[PDB]
Amino acid sequence: TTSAGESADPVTTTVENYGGETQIQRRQHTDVSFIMDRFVKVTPQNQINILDLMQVPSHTLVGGLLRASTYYFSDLEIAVKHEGDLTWVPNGAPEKALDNTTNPTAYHKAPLTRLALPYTAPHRVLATVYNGECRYSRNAVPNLRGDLQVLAQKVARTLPTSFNYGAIKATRVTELLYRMKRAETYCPRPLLAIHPTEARHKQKIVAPVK
Amino acid sequence: SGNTGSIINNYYMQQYQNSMDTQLGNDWFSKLASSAFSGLFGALLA
C-alpha cells in the first residue's frame, strides 16, 4: 500500500495484498510479565548488596529487555548463596539497620535462601534512566540544547538514591539472582542485536551428535 | 500470571506474597498496533 510516510501512523500490510493468507500467531512468549519472570545472576559485593535491578548486565535477556523500557514496576524474588544469616532492610533504611536481626533475617539453610520481597520505593514507578539529579544542595540543572556532544555532561550521574528494593547483608554473599515479579513496562527504548562484521552473524547452533 | 504454573492456591495471603496496589480517581501499544492501516490506498484492478 502506499501511505504518507511522514505521518508515523502505523501501516501493517498483509500477504493478502498478493494472494497469501495471514496465519494465527501465539505470542505468549513476548508478554512482558512472562519473559521478565526468570532469575538472572548478578556479581555480588562481599557483604552489603543494595538490591538495584540496574545491576543486571545489559546484554543478558532480563538486562536487555529491562533497559528497553523507561519506567517499570515489579515485585521481586532473590535467591542468595551466603555465609551467616541474611538480613534485608526496605528502601529508605539507614545502612546500619542491616546489622539488626528484627529486620527480615533468614537463618542459613543450605544450599541458598530464596525470598519474595515487595516493591518498597516511595515512587509510583522506577526508571531505568533518569535525566536529572536527586541532591538538592547543588546549583540548578542546565537546560541543555545542542547536538549529541551536549549529553556527555551527564555521565557522572548515578540514578537517584530512592531507586532500589532495599538491601541485603550476610557475612559473605557468594551468589545473587534477581527475578522480577508481576512486571510492568512503559515507554519503549532501543534494543540492540550484536552488530555483524559479515553479511550474517553466524554462531554454532546446537546440532546432533556426530 | 507471568511464569507461574501451580494449580493450587498459595499457602500465604495475597497481602503477604505481593505488594498491594492502590487506585486514584497492551494499554497504549496494543491500541497502537490494532489501529494500523492494513488496506490498500490505490483502486485495485483485478
Place this chain on the structure above:
Amino acid sequence: SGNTGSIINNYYMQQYQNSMDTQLGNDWFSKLASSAFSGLFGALLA
C-alpha cells in the same frame, strides 16, 4: 491477626496454640483520637 499470613487453618487446636481468655461480668486512645475538635473556633470570612 498480627504478622501472620497463612490461608489454611492451624493443624493444632486453638486451646493448644494459644492461652485461652476469660471474661468477667483502639478502645481508649481510638475514642480519644476520634473525639478531636477538627473545626475552627472563629467566624470565617471568605
Place this chain on the structure above:
Amino acid sequence: SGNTGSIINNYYMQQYQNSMDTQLGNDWFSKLASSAFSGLFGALLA
C-alpha cells in the same frame, strides 16, 4: 496415559507439564488389523 499411575491431579498446569498441541482444518494399523479377512474362501463340508 503411558506408564503413569497417580490418582491425584498434577500440582502443575498442563501448559507447563507438557507441550500443547494444535490442530489444522490404532488410526491406520488398527483399521488395517481390524479389516483382516477371518473367514474361509471354500464351501465347508461338515
Place this chain on the structure above:
Amino acid sequence: GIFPVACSDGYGGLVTTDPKTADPVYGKVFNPPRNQLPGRFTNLLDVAEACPTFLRFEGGVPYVTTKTDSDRVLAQFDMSLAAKHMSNTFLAGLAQYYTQYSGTINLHFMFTGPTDAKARYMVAYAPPGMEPPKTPEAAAHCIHAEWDTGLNSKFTFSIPYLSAADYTYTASDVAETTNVQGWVCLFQITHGKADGDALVVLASAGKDFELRLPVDARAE
C-alpha cells in the same frame, strides 16, 4: 504407596519476621480476666494524634520567648522528623522505626504571658528549592497563618505534605528530595509588652499522617 513430595531448596530456614506460628507444646491454659482494663491503645498513631508532645528550642526548653529587637524570626527548622527540634517528640520517637511517612503533621502554639501581654505571630511552610524566608514579608508568599493572643491560648496549624513522591523518608542523609522537605518558619509580627513571655510548642500527627515500612536501626 505414599504421597510423594519435593522438599524444596531455598525454603525452610527461620526468618525473624515470617507469617507462620510455632508448634505448641503446653495446652489448655486459661488466663485471668482482663476485660475492660483502662488505657488500651491499638494503633500507635491514635496516641500520636490525641497526645501532642513538646518541641525543643535552643537551650533545651519547649518554648520560644518573644524577642524585642528587629529580628522577627522566633524559630526556623527543617521539616524533618530527624530535626533536633522534633527529637524529644513522641512522633520522632515513633518515626525512627519506619522508613517512610506521608501526610499531615500539626503544630500547636500556646501563649503563656499575663493578661496585659499581647502578641501577633505567623507560621509559614517554606518548600524546598529556595532558601527559607528571613522576614515575615518574604514569608507572606508561602502557605502561612497569622493569629494573635486573647481568651484562647492555643492555635493549631497543619504542615502539609507537599513533595514530588508519594512518600518521604523519616531518616536524613545529606540534603536531598526524598529526606528534606523544606522548612517551618515561626515569626513574630509584633507584641505589646510581651517581652520575655514564652509561647510553647507541641506537635501531634494529623488526620492522614501515615508511617510505613518497619525498620530496626540501633537508636533511642
Place this chain on the structure above:
Amino acid sequence: GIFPVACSDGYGGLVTTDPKTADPVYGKVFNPPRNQLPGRFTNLLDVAEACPTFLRFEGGVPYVTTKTDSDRVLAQFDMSLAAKHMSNTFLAGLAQYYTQYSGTINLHFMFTGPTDAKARYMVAYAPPGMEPPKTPEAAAHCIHAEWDTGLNSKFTFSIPYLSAADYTYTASDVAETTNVQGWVCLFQITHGKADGDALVVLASAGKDFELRLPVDARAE
C-alpha cells in the same frame, strides 16, 4: 500417627525459570497509585508492529540512493534476522532472545527526493534453492511488487514466511534449511532525474509474526 510422605530424589533444587514463588517475609505493603500511566506495553510484538525501525545499508546509513548506471540492484540481503542489514532494528534486537520465529515481516520504503525527482522501484522475495536474481527481469518470476513516486512517499510490502518447516531459526550458522530463508531483492526499474536521492527503509513485524522459545545467548 502423622501423614507419611516420600521425599523424592530428583525434585527440589532451585531452577532459574521455575513455575513456583518464594515464601514472603514482609507483609502488608500498599503501593503508590500508578493507574493510568502513559505508554504501557504488554507484548513486545505490539511495539514491533506499531514502530518500524531502520535498516542499514553500506556505509551505515538507513537508505539506498538511486544509482545511475546499468546496475539496477539497489540492495540484496539474506532473509535472516541475523543479517547485517537488519542488525540495528528493534526486530533483530528482540529476535536474539528467542530461538524460532514464524510469520510476516514488513518492509517500508520512503522516497526522499524533491518534487521533480521521479522513480520506479521493485522488491522481490527470492526463495532458497537457487541463486538470487541479478536483474529486474529475472526477478519478475518471483513474488514481487513494483511502485513509483507521487503524493504518497511510502510503500509497504509483506515478506512471506515460506519454508518446509513451520518455524525457522532466528540465529544463523552456515547456510541451511532451518536458518536461511532466501533473499530480498530491491531493484530500481528506472528514474527521471532522481540521481543521488535517498529511499529510506524500515521493517516492522507483520500481523502474524511470532517469536517463540526464549533463549539468553550473551549478545547486544
Place this chain on the structure above:
Amino acid sequence: GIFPVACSDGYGGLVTTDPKTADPVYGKVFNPPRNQLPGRFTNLLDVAEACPTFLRFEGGVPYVTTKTDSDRVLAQFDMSLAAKHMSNTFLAGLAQYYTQYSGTINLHFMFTGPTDAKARYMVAYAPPGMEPPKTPEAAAHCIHAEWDTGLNSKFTFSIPYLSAADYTYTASDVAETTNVQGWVCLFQITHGKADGDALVVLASAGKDFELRLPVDARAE
C-alpha cells in the same frame, strides 16, 4: 504450628519405570500441527497382525522347495519364538522385549510355481511329550490341515496355544514345559511336476496373540 509429616525410609529414590512425572521448568510451548499424519500405529500387535514377515529356512531363504524323493518333510521347527526359523520375523523381534505370551500365531504359505506345477501340502502342530512325526501318516493324528494349489496362491493356518500354564515364555533355556511348546511340521503329500518350485512362508499374530511383562535383555 504447621503440618507434621513422617519422611519415610524406603521411599523416594529414582526408579527407571516409575508412575510419576518430573517437575516442569519451561512453559507455554505450542507444537506445530500434526493431526492426520499417515501411518500411525498405537499397539505394536496391530502391526504384528496386519503385516506377516517371512520365515527362514536353511540357506537363508524365505521358502522351502518341493523335493522329489521319498522324504516328505519340507520343514520341522520348534514352536518357539526363539526358533532360528522365526528369527527374522517381526513377531520374534517384538517377543524378545516381553517374558511371556499367549494365543494364536498364524502361518501363511504361498505357492510360487508356474501354472502347470501342482502340489498338495500338510501342516501339523505336534504337541510336546513325544517325538514329532516324521511322516504325513504319523502326523495325521495331530491337529493338521492339508490343501493343494489352484487359483488362490495362499493358505493360512492358526497354530493353537495348548500348554498346561496360561502363559508361556518367549525366551528358551534348555527343553522345558514353560519354554518348548512342541513342533510345527510341514510335509509335502505329493506334487505333479513342481520339482524345484518354492512355497514361501510368513507368520503374523493371531486375533488373541498376547505379549506381557516388558523386559530389556541386551539383544538384536
Place this chain on the structure above:
Amino acid sequence: EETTLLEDRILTTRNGHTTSTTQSSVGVTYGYATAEDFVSGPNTSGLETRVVQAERFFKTHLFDWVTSDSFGRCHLLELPTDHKGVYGSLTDSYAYMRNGWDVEVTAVGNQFNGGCLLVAMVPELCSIQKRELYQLTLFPHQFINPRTNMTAHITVPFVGVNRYDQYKVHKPWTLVVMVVAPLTVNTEGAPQIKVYANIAPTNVHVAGEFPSKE
C-alpha cells in the same frame, strides 16, 4: 491530501491567545496517551492549581539544516527550557509543577529540496549511542520531508516516576531533530533550511509557593 503545485492539508492549532496555521499538515502525533493521568494526587495534599495563562506558544530556533550534515546529526532541546514569560516565572514561584507539551517543528525550504528530518519527543534522554538512532522511531515522532511537508506536530503528556516534578533538578522530555537523509538543494531548492520550534505547555499545574526575595 489536496491540490495543484501547493496544498490543503490545513491545520490551525490554538493554545491560549496564540494560533499557528500550516497548509502542509500531515496530522498530529499523540505520544503514549490521548489525555493526562490524574493531576490531583496524594503528594500535593489538594494544594495544587491550574494556571491557564501559561498554556500558549513560545518560540526558539533549533539549528540550520545544511548539505554537510550527515545521517545521525541531531539537535536536542531539553524541556523545560528558558522561558522569559509567565511559564518561566512559575518555575521560580512554585516548588512543584507538571505539564505536557504541544510541539510544532518547522523546516521551511521549498518542494525542490530533498532529504529528510525525523522529529521525536524522547523521555529521560540521558545518552544515545549512534546505533540507537536506528530505533528513534520507538518514540513519539513525525518526519519532515520537503516534497510533502514543512511541519511536524507531536502532542505528548507529562511522564515521570513522580506525579509532580521539580524542574530545577529534572528534565522529563527532550525534543530531538535528527537528519535521516542529507539535505539536497539541486538548482531550485532553498540553499539551507532553518529549523524552528513553536512549543506550548499544556495542562500546567503548580503546587508549593515559594517565598519572595523581599
